[PDB]
Amino acid sequence: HNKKFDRSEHVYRNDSFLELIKDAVRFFSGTPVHSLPPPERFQGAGVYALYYTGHYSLYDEYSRINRKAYNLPIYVGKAVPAGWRQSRISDHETRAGSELSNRIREHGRNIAKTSNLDLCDFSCRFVIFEATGSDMISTVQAALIKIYKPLWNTVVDGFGNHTPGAGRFAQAKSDWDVIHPGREWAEKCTGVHSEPYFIEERIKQYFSKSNFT
Amino acid sequence: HNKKFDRSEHVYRNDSFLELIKDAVRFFSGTPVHSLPPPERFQGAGVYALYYTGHYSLYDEYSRINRKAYNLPIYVGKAVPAGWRQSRISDHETRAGSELSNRIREHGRNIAKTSNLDLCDFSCRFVIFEATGSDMISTVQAALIKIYKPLWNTVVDGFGNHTPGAGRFAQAKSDWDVIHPGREWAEKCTGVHSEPYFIEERIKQYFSK
DNA sequence: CGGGAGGCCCGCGGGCCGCCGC
DNA sequence: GCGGCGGCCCGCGGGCCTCCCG
């Protein structure tokens, strides 16, 4: 330190930044909706949201909530640019990844692999954040989860996992995997996972119990 | 589906963002520097930076980069308020928590337990956001990591690990843990971990381009 | 017995590498 | 023989719940 303690001198407010985030959020909400995955590959990093309109019994309510419009996402995710560990040198030119697009395609493949969900019942929205604006990517994703409370982000976790891998097989298969088998790596997880009965009830409770702030 | 497909209808641009992120970053830059951990506990969520002024041979450069001022952090982190996956299972009673302060303290403890790093050679800065502002925390952290590329966030990974736990006993120990034993839990990781020579050249590379 | 810090689980998804498709 | 994408590792730290202080 070398200097006295005082909480107040460390508080940061910027209401302007709060408006800026609201703006990115409302821009997200009105971007075009596509099939999962979108008809074309593209470059960029950003945020995306997945919507359900099918009739799988635990999720049937989405067919009504999302009947006339894409109102409530089941999942919101992100893909942050390859911006890594850095030392901006050579390290030659080779520019422009397709991180957002790949992740969207990846999540498509996981749903394809399940028995009980059909990919044709999913749709998506996404927003590309470029350059310096890419710093905002994980805060837009958090802002969207806070407004929508997507089921797969806040109740039935696990959709977001890539393969835990060999160094991690002792872990329990996630609630998403237990009600939507089978990504095959999920069958190599040896830990104690939750029982379908208790996940089913949580999903029901999601819909029946009011979530309005 | 919709009807078209047009990449630029999905691209967000707002140049005023550059000014706001600049402002947040200079505010962070000018907040009071304290020991690690700070001398008092405090409530709030936020972002923090760790600075080194010591003489451990690999890191010796910092004692010059940080000689006259706290310029280049060695680590940047963040602590978010309780439940950012839409909060716990509660009613209306206790909206105040200490997750930033706790988190900074944990990092101190981990440094205390190493053999080759002295806590006295460490300082920190931290910024609190509250409570409408918390969505802002990650974007400031990310800006800071991008601008300073702290060595423990970019080259010598793993200081931010919590205990992997009994589900992940077969994973490798982290580069940080290999050059800075010992958190007792890294000792219980049985995977093949990086060589110290490899890490040490990455460190040297960090301080000559 | 009560509140909060910390211990100890895993969600999410970054990055790298090998493999396949060219 | 090359580039891009998926497969397979673990980084970072969230969140629950324990237990540790009161």
Structure tokens at A173: 């298969």
Length of chain B: 209
> CA–C1' distance B168–C6 (Å)?
19
| Vertex B79: Cα angle to B76 and B82 (nearest 5) | 170
> CA–C1' distance B99–C5 (Å)?
10
| Separation in Å, CA B54 to CA B116, B122, B203 | 11, 8, 16
Beta strands in chain B (DSSP E): 11-12, 34-35, 45-52, 73-79, 122-129
Q: Which nucleotide lies at the shortest CA–C1' distance from B165?
A: C8
Contact A146 B86 (CB under 8 A): yes
Instruction: Tell me how far apart the alpha carbons of residues B136 and B132 are, in angstroms, rounded to a whole number.
Output: 9
> CA–C1' distance B98–C1 (Å)?
23
Enumerate the H helices of chain A as residue ranges.
15-29, 61-65, 99-112, 137-148, 151-154, 175-179, 196-208
Strand D reaches within 7 A of the B101 CB: no
Q: Which residues contact B105 (CB under 8 A, 6 or more apart)?
A: B37, B41
**Residue A193 DSSP code:** P
Which of A31, A43, A167 comes nearest B170 by C-beta? A167
Helix (H, G, I), strand (E, B) or coil at B13: coil
Q: Check if the beta carbon of residue A165 is closer than 8 Å to that of residue A43.
A: no
Helix (H, G, I), strand (E, B) or coil at B86: coil
* H or E element, residue A195: none
Q: Check if the beta carbon of residue A125 is closer than 8 Å to that of residue A31.
A: yes
Contact B136 A17 (CB under 8 A): yes
**Count of pairs with CB atoms under 8 A, one residue in A, one in B:** 183
Strand C reaches within 7 A of the B204 CB: no
Helix (H, G, I), strand (E, B) or coil at B122: strand
Which residue, among B93, B74, B87, has the nearest Cα to B45 in the 3D structure? B87
Residue A135 burial (CB < 10 Å; 0-12/13-18/19+)?
buried
Q: Check if the beta carbon of residue B206 is closer than 8 Å to that of residue B60.
A: no
Q: What are the chain A neighbours of B86 within 8 Å (beta carbons)? A: 145-146, 149, 153-154, 211
CA distance B178 to chain A (A): 17
Helix (H, G, I), strand (E, B) or coil at A54: coil
Most B CBs within 10 Å, among A7, A10, A34, A66, to test the B interface: A10
Search chain A and give the residue with CA nearest B51. Answer: A1
Which residue, among B126, B136, B101, B147, has the nearest Cα to B27 in the 3D structure? B126
Strand D reaches within 7 A of the A166 CB: yes
Contact A211 B86 (CB under 8 A): yes
Instruction: Tell me how far apart the alpha carbons of residues B109 and B122 are, in angstroms, rounded to a whole number.
Output: 12
Instruction: Tell me how far apart the alpha carbons of residues A197 and A179 are, in angstroms, rounded to a whole number.
Output: 10
Cβ of B2: how many Cβ atoms within 10 Å? Answer: 16
Instruction: Tell me how far apart the alpha carbons of residues A52 and A71 are, in angstroms, rounded to a whole number.
Output: 10
Largest CA distance in chain A: 64
Protein residue minimizing CA–C1' distance to D8: A165
Instruction: Tell me how far apart the alpha carbons of residues B123 and B36 are, in angstroms, rounded to a whole number.
Output: 5
Which residue, among B77, B156, B144, B145, has the nearest Cα to B116 in the 3D structure? B156
Instruction: Tell me how far apart the alpha carbons of residues A59 and A56 are, in angstroms, rounded to a whole number.
Output: 6
Q: How many C-alpha atoms does B168 have within 13 Å on its Cβ side?
A: 14
Structure tokens at B204: 């040297």
> CA–C1' distance A152–C19 (Å)?
32
Instruction: Tell me how far apart the alpha carbons of residues B75 and A5 are, in angstroms, rounded to a whole number.
Output: 22
CA distance A106 to chain B (A): 18
Which residue, among A189, A192, A149, A185, has the nearest Cα to A170 in the 3D structure? A189
CA distance A109 to chain B (A): 18
Q: Which residues contact B25 (CB under 8 A, 6 or more apart)?
A: B140, B143, B144, B147
Instruction: Tell me how far apart the alpha carbons of residues A97 and B106 are, in angstroms, rounded to a whole number.
Output: 36
Q: How was this structure determined?
A: X-ray
CA distance B63 to chain A (A): 16
Which positions on chain C have an atom < 7 Å from some protein CB? 3-16
Structure tokens at A107: 């999540």
Strand D reaches within 7 A of the A113 CB: no
